[PDB]
Every structure is written in C-alpha cells, then in structure tokens.
Enzyme design. Sequence first.
Site, PDB file in Angstrom:
ATOM      1  N   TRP A 130       0.899  -1.166   0.000  1.00 26.93           N
ATOM      2  CA  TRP A 130       0.000   0.000   0.000  1.00 26.93           C
ATOM      3  C   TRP A 130       0.950   1.233   0.000  1.00 26.93           C
ATOM      4  CZ3 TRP A 130      -1.184   3.190   4.695  1.00 26.93           C
ATOM      5  CH2 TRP A 130      -2.232   4.106   4.481  1.00 26.93           C
ATOM      6  N   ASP A 211      -0.568  -4.784   9.773  1.00 24.64           N
ATOM      7  CA  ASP A 211      -1.488  -3.801   9.241  1.00 24.64           C
ATOM      8  C   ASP A 211      -2.695  -4.677   8.914  1.00 24.64           C
ATOM      9  OD1 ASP A 211      -2.915  -1.816   7.964  1.00 24.64           O
ATOM     10  OD2 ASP A 211      -1.517  -1.552   6.327  1.00 24.64           O
ATOM     11  N   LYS A 246     -13.121  -0.294   5.962  1.00 17.81           N
ATOM     12  CA  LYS A 246     -13.682  -1.179   4.952  1.00 17.81           C
ATOM     13  C   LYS A 246     -14.665  -2.205   5.468  1.00 17.81           C
ATOM     14  CE  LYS A 246      -9.493   0.248   3.203  1.00 17.81           C
ATOM     15  NZ  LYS A 246      -8.135   0.000   3.697  1.00 17.81           N
TER      16      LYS A 246
HETATM   17  C1  LIG Z   1      -7.245   0.986   4.015  1.00 13.38           C
HETATM   18  C2  LIG Z   1      -5.842   0.580   4.494  1.00 13.38           C
HETATM   19  C3  LIG Z   1      -5.166   1.261   5.515  1.00 13.38           C
HETATM   20  C4  LIG Z   1      -5.702   2.492   6.247  1.00 13.38           C
HETATM   21  O1  LIG Z   1      -7.006   2.770   6.162  1.00 13.38           O
HETATM   22  P1  LIG Z   1      -7.820   3.913   6.965  1.00 13.38           P
HETATM   23  O2  LIG Z   1      -8.589   4.242   5.808  1.00 13.38           O
HETATM   24  O3  LIG Z   1      -6.874   4.992   7.323  1.00 13.38           O
HETATM   25  O4  LIG Z   1      -8.463   3.206   8.069  1.00 13.38           O
HETATM   26  C5  LIG Z   1      -3.915   0.830   5.897  1.00 13.38           C
HETATM   27  N1  LIG Z   1      -3.347  -0.245   5.291  1.00 13.38           N
HETATM   28  C6  LIG Z   1      -3.999  -0.911   4.299  1.00 13.38           C
HETATM   29  C7  LIG Z   1      -3.335  -2.122   3.631  1.00 13.38           C
HETATM   30  C8  LIG Z   1      -5.233  -0.511   3.899  1.00 13.38           C
HETATM   31  O5  LIG Z   1      -5.860  -1.210   2.886  1.00 13.38           O
END
Ligand SMILES: *Cc1c(COP(=O)(O)O)cnc(C)c1O
Lengths: 396, 396
Positions: A130, A211, A246
């Site tokens: 990411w 994460d 999500k």
């Molecule tokens: C969506 C996501 C995040 C952070 O999402 P927030 O929208 O800030 O809650 C962090 N790491 C990954 C791999 C993600 O898909």
Amino acid sequence: MFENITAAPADPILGLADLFRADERPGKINLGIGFYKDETGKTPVLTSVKKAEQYLLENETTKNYLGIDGIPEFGRCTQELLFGKGSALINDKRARTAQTPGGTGALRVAADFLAKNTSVKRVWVSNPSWPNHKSVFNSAGLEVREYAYYDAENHTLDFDALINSLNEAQAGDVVLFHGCCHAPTGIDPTLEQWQTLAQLSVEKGWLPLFDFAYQGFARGLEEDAEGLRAFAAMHKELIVASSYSKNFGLYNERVGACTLVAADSETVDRAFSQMKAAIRANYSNPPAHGASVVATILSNDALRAIWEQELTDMRQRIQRMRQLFVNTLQEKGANRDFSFIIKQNGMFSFSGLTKEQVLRLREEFGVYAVASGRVNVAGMTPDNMAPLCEAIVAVL
Amino acid sequence: MFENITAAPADPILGLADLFRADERPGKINLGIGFYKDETGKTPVLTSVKKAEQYLLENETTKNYLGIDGIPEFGRCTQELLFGKGSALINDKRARTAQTPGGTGALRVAADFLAKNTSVKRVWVSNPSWPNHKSVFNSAGLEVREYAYYDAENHTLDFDALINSLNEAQAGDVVLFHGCCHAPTGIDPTLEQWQTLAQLSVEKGWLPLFDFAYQGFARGLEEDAEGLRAFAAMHKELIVASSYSKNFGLYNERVGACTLVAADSETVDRAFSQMKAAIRANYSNPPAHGASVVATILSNDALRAIWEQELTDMRQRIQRMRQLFVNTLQEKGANRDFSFIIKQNGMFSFSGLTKEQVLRLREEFGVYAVASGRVNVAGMTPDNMAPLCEAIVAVL
Ligand SMILES: *Cc1c(COP(=O)(O)O)cnc(C)c1O
Ligand SMILES: *Cc1c(COP(=O)(O)O)cnc(C)c1O
C-alpha cells in the site's frame, strides 16, 4: 516564507478520478477506486451502522473529550476480534489498545512511538505494498526497506525470495505484515507459512507490525486472524494497526486502533503511557462517532448479527465477481490464463496487463485501471462484466 | 524492545480528576476541568448540533472518504468566520483551509508542514501558555521559545516585557498568538496593541501562527476576530489553527481547521499541496461527523441563529460567574482585590492563590484547582458560589 515551496507530486489515483469524470463516454468503467461498491456501483452506509447511529442520536448526553486511548469498550472489542474471545493475551493483560483516527493514524502513532521511544531505525515493507506506507514511516524519521513478495511470472507469493531478502533484516528491525487480503496482490501466506514466518521472526528478533485493514474479507472474521494469532502465540511483543474503514464501511469517520503487546502488563502499561504521550502531541484524543458506532454494534448481539451478515454479503460479492471475471474472459476467447484471480483475496489484484495495455484500454474503451495493472474487483458488476472483458480481450 | 521504556510523566490535571473522584466529601467543587459546564454542572450537546445530527442521519447516503482537506463547505464557512464575509483574502483566494482532527491536530499539521517545507526552526510561545503547545512543536522537530506576557503583580498584559523579549526573535521565526481568551490568563491585547503587534511583526519578519479556540467567548464572533484581521490586513502570509471544540461543544468529534494564507493563490496552492502531503502521512483524511455538523449549522440560517444564541448564552454565563465570584468574595470579607477577574475573558484565570493555598483548599475544603492557581469559571454555579468563596477567604 512559502514563496519557493515546490508543489507536492500529483497523486496518480486522484489524477485518474479526474480523467474519469471528464470522460464523455457512457460505458466507462472505473477499476482504480480503492473502496467497496455493491452491484449498483454504490457505497451505502451499512444498515447496522444506521441503526447504531439512531441509537447514539437518542442516547448521547455530552460530546466531552474521550480519554487519550478512546472508548474503553471499543478497545476491548477490537482485542477480542484480533486475538480471540478468550486469548491469554487478554487474560494476562499483555495488550493495550488506543483508538486512532483510522488505520493510517494507527500506523503513524506506532511510527512516532517507535521512533522516539525505541532503538528502531528501519521498517521492512513488502514489495509491492500500500503506497502511503513509506511516507508515514519516513515522516516519523524511520527508514523504509523492502522485501520480496510477489512472483510476477507465476502470480503468487515468492516465499523463497521473501525469506531470503528478509534475512538481511537485523535484530530490532520492524517487519510489517498485512494480516489478510494483501494489498495490492490479494496473495496471503498460508497458515503453515505464517507459522514458519513467526518462528523465524522469533529467532532473528524482528518486531512484527501488522497492518490489519480487511479482517472479514478473505474467509471470515476468525479465519482471517489466524496468521496474527500464530505470531502472537510466539512473540512477547508486537504491534497491530487495525482499520474499520472497509469492514464497517465507515471510511470517513476515521476509526481504527493501535494495539501494543508486551511481555507483561507492567511493561505494556509503561510502554503504553509513551504511546499516549505521542497521541497527545498529535491530535490530542480520538473522534468518538465512528468508534462509538463500532462499539455499540460489536457489543449488541442483535446488531452484531446483522453486521456480520452484511460483511459476508460483501465478501461473497467480491468472491462472485472474481469468478465471473475469470470465466467471462474465458468465454470472450482469452487464450490466456487468468485463473489466478480466483486464488486471491480481497478486492485487489494485478491483472497482468502492461502500462500500454491499461492506457489504450482507457483512451479506447473508457476502462480505467491503475498503470500497474491493478484492478478493484468491487468495480465490476454482473452488468458491466461483458463490455469489460471484451475490452480486455481486445488489447491482449 | 519495550522492556526498558520509561513511563511518561503523569498528567497533573488527570491526577486531579482522580483525586476528585476519590473524594468522599459531598460539597466538593472542581475548578480544574478544562471545558464548559452549565448551571447544572453539565456539558450537554447543544440543541443546534442535535438538530444537525438528526439531519445527517436522515440524509447521509455513504461514508466514503472525504478529500485530504475535508468538506468544502466547512472550509468556506471557517474562512468567513475568521476573516469576515467579504474579506479580500477570500476574494483574491489567498487562503486554503484543511479540516483537521481538532485544534490540536491543526497545530500538528502546521508543525509538520513548517518543519519539512520551510526554514523555520523556532516557535515563540507566550509564557504562560496552553501546556500541550511545546510537545506538538517539539515532536515535529521545532524548538520552542517563550516571550513574556503575564504581569503577576498587577494581573495584566506586560506589553513592554512582551515586545522586549520578542525582539530576540529572528526573521523567519514563527510567533504563536492566542486569537482571543488567552489561556490560561484570560488577558487579551487591545485592538491598538494588536495593531502595533502586526506592524512590528511585519518589520521583523515573523510568521504569525494564530491559535483560535475560543471565538465567541470574549465579546462576539466578529469582535473576537479583530486581532487576527488586523494581522491579516498587513501580512502576506500567516497560519491559523482553529477549533470548534468549545464554541460548538463538539469536544470529542475532533473538529478544527488549519488555514494557510499566502501572497497569492498560485503560491497558496503550491504550499497547500505540501500541507496535504503532511496530512496524508499522518491520518490520511479527516473525520466527517463533527465537521459535517458544523457545516450544516453554519450554512443554515435557522440553525445558525439558534447556535449563535446558545453561544452567547455560554458567553454570558461565564461573564455572570466572574462578576458573581468577585462580589461574593467581596461580601465574605476579602480585604483583598479580585476585581481583575472581571477584566479577563474566557473561562480561565489565575486566582492569585499560592500552591500551598490551593493545596489546603483541596485537602481541607474539597475545592480542587490547578497548582498554579488557575481556576475554571465554568465550574462555578450560583449554588456553589457561597461555599467556594468561604473556602477562599479561609485560606487567604
Ligand atoms: C485501508 C488501508 C489502511 C488504512 O485505512 P484507513 O482508511 O486509514 O483506516 C492501511 N493499510 C492498508 C493495507 C489498507 O488497505
Ligand atoms: C482547546 C484548545 C486547543 C485545541 O483544542 P481541540 O480540543 O484539539 O480542538 C488549542 N489551543 C488552545 C488555547 C485551546 O484552548
């Protein structure tokens, strides 16, 4: 003072968003979004959260500041979701959770806490990963390194290259892992692989940082936590940044948590006090709304049952689209293999398309995807599936 | 890894909170709170915000991510509140506003943006000042310096000492100002003083950073912005961190803004892009709820009128308590002057009590105040006023 400040680099996905808007063509498809969409191409607020919000509206008596670590019930609920209802980590009280502004915010408070309170200097991130990861860690003063992960040729987890590059990591180095639904590949280690990764991790002295943004999107809530739980059983210390953006469809309410695990309560409490000092120097305390909604859903049997059902619905839709995609391409005459799509988890995957292919796919067909060939499966609906695949076949 | 982490220092106001809870005595008073309370000793959610929340519950269709800078209307509304409905800064488009997690979060994004994008190294803070200031700036890598402000003897703004110490500040140094209701003194510069401070500021080349957390608590919404507007008329560049925690009673929803002002739109846009990069590396994007509530109130004539009335009610109550305090002490036989209390703005002031006095006041009377003699006027009600003053008189 600001007269010579150079502009920041244009965010490629935002640039796509604009081009998509300005596209006069009717049959345009957008596969470079980054969030969930249902069959209607919409991202509704879940029914369970609407119910929880009605509950809060009628029961809130004050908007007074939450504690630095946020709502207590929210912390308890995320710990059980993460480690299991009766985990020893919870009974021995080795974990402390701080409510943060989303999953990104959890990573940043971890970064700041790590950088100012420990001897960590490097953070190992998967390649690919990411995009925002680097900037979070780099702004906290940490150096970012990458370990191999994806096998472009066979479209799978290059375990060998992974372990090989990860051996250049020294003791005291932080290693970042995606709990499930690896972004952007959708390729996750198998349980046996997670188990060898945890054992190895212990021998070399890595500080695991998980994460966890898609719990519930691969197989189920508990199934998806298996990897983390394999590590937690062996490690005395670890950090997990979680997001509810999500799985609860609460993107803009910024709801996530940063969980610290130490060898004992005494040490986790002392370490946690510094994590709170880090939060205080940043946003002071967390946004109640989104997290309040999550805590009332998770603690209510009725509301939680509805939510769990809404989440499997999302999971299944994504599982349905991956299957549909594969055989719709196999019907239009693909003479190429895309079967790997069915073996990947979450809403993301690399299509295996080249930048030139994704470019003409866009300008000639109005199908927008990321230059890397990354497509979001939630952007596909049984209605746009045929015109999509015909475009894919046309540029192969 | 965390086994030798030293605990963070105990927060003195939190320590007070505990001692207060554990106080068996019935007639206990708490003047070291830090937020507003009505005559009932409660901090209710405003009626205008409850209405706005019902509106959102019925009209929200998605919880999808907001842009890095947040809700557009929210930005427009804060700029008018700050600079006036038809300000040239708005017409010439020299200002850009980013929605942040509260006023503390606005200061931190300013800090990070400043530290990584400019040549600033020092930030000048008043003495005394809101405690958390230092840590925000220091964690961003900036050095904090202090300028004189309070005259303990006469209980007023030591303008001379202020200007004198502020001349040691070099060009390119950031100078932090409280827009109104200076914390913790409640002493604000007069308009003529703000005007000479702005003129001086221009000659020496300071980069003004305004912390605006109490607009509406001193005299009125527009009156309170006078100082900032005096500076904005003369400066080509400035930064203002605003909070809606106190004036909208939205403490826990984390709603504030960080406004950047440059010489022109071209430069403010380029500088703003880097401020957005800083946000992205922190919490990614802001919490919609609290800010959504503020934007619907401010843009609705009906809701805004109610809100403005609720705010004056709060302002007036505080103005009433300061007066009551002074003459209730003057009735119990004070043979000492506390008239300065009436000349100060906001909910805070230094009582002029010594640490030993505040200590026995606590252990012998159950009246809790901060060691510095700082008392929160919103903790006083016409019902606890007599027993309060009797305790004050007893320790004088
Ligand atoms: C969506 C996501 C995040 C952070 O999402 P927030 O929208 O800030 O809650 C962090 N790491 C990954 C791999 C993600 O898909
Ligand atoms: C309340 C306050 C802030 C920050 O408040 P938030 O609660 O983070 O919005 C900043 N400065 C001063 C002087 C304040 O009183």
